[PDB]
């Protein structure tokens, strides 16, 4: 399948070169997989989700996304126009308030929630969790991310936006999950992206168009935007049978475009997520 005039990040992850605008992907499109977006919520009524998104948990007075961030991330995973995996099932877990903030104890609870809740959902092709959030190092937060991964969920986490070594942020620094840095449309590391040996992969993160609350769209930047590209890619590859939750981060790194990014500090991987789709 081909989607013309796609957002640049979708085109980039199906391409060996920058500068194109068509997204190529297998029609299966993540059908039968599930992606949890652990964030500010998801505006499930947005036409772009087509009934495939549901809020399943909140830790606040409402499950509504009053911010937009979680809706944007969910859109990059799985909206019809702006998403990688256009037929996946999206589940929202609201661990961040409408200001985009959350206590670590609530974030931990949300991760352990997903490890259990996947047993309440039909996801025959596999389960992914996308965590576009983080803060300073916490062993308890890292341990929760490790548990979620251990339980059979592909965990993708944002590296962070301090232009610093990600070893000092959580859950970015947990080795067993898939830590995602951000790139721009000219294959430069995004200027804010964290780096370091704990990164596993880069994805598009500067000027990413996706869904927003109020039935709208907008373009924003962050490692928060790169992470759902990798989460959606994992769901897509799991539906195709190419990998599993335990193996997907390694598979994505093995099949990535190599050596194509600029301003990669020495010691950080030079790997850009790629779907290897050949029509
Ligand atoms: Ca890993």
Domain range annotation of the chain: 2-272
Query: Distance between CA atoms of 221 and 14, rounded to whole angstroms?
Result: 20
Binding-site residue numbers for Ca(2+) are 16, 175, 177, 200, 260
Q: Are 182 and 205 in contact (CB under 8 A)?
A: yes
253 alpha carbon to ligand 1 midpoint, in Å? 9
Superfamily of domain 2-272: Peptidase S8/S53 domain (3.40.50.200)
What angle do the packed helices 139-150 and 104-117 form, to 10 degrees?
A: 10
Obtained via which technique? X-ray
Comparing CA positions, the residue from 71, 271, 252 lying closest to residue 183 is: 271
Query: Distance between CA atoms of 171 and 168, rounded to whole angstroms?
Result: 9
42 secondary structure, DSSP code: -
214 alpha carbon to ligand 1 midpoint, in Å? 36
Comparing CA positions, the residue from 135, 133, 136, 163 lying closest to residue 224 is: 133
| Angle (nearest 5°) at CA 69 between 65 and 70 | 60
Query: Distance between CA atoms of 72 and 249, rounded to whole angstroms?
Result: 22
The 3 state secondary structure assigned to 252-268 is HHHCCEECCCECCCCCC
Q: Where are the alpha helices (DSSP H) in the chain?
A: 8-13, 69-78, 104-117, 139-150, 223-239, 248-254
5 alpha carbon to ligand 1 midpoint, in Å? 33
Residues taking part in catalysis? 39, 69, 224
Q: Are 47 and 138 in contact (CB under 8 A)?
A: no
Token pair 């126009």 in the structure block, residue? 81
250 alpha carbon to ligand 1 midpoint, in Å? 7
Write out the DSSP string of 61-117.
S--S-SSSHHHHHHHHHH-TTT-SSTT-EEEEEE-S-TTS---HHHHHHHHHHHHHH
Q: Are 38 and 118 in contact (CB under 8 A)?
A: no
């Amino acid at each position: 399948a081909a989607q013309t005039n796609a957002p640049w990040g979708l085109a980039r992850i199906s391409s060996t070169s920058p500068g194109t605008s068509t997204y190529y992907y297998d029609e299966s499109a993540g059908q039968g997989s599930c992606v949890y977006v652990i964030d500010t919520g998801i505006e499930a009524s947005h036409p772009e989700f087509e009934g495939r998104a549901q809020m399943v948990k909140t830790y606040y007075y409402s499950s509504r996304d009053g911010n937009g961030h979680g809706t944007h991330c969910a859109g990059t995973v799985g909206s019809r126009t702006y998403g990688v995996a256009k037929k996946t099932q999206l589940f929202g877990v609201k661990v961040l308030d409408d200001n985009g903030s959350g206590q670590y104890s609530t974030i931990i609870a949300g991760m352990d929630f997903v490890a259990s809740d996947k047993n309440n959902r039909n996801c025959p092709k596999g389960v992914v969790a996308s965590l576009s959030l983080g803060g300073g190092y916490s062993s308890s937060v890292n341990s929760a991310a490790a548990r979620l991964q251990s339980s059979g969920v592909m965990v993708a986490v944002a590296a962070g936006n301090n232009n610093a070594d990600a070893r000092n942020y959580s859950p970015a620094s947990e080795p067993s999950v898939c830590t995602v840095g951000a790139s721009d449309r000219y294959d430069r590391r995004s200027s804010f992206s964290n780096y370091g040996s704990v990164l596993d992969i880069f994805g598009p993160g500067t000027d990413i168009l996706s869904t927003w609350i109020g039935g709208s769209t907008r373009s924003i930047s962050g490692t928060s935007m790169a992470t759902p590209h990798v989460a959606g890619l994992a769901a897509y590859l799991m539906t195709l049978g190419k990998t599993t939750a335990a193996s997907a981060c390694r598979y994505i790194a093995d099949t990535a475009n190599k050596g194509d990014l600029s301003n990669i500090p020495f010691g950080t991987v030079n790997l850009l997520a790629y779907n290897n789709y050949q029509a």
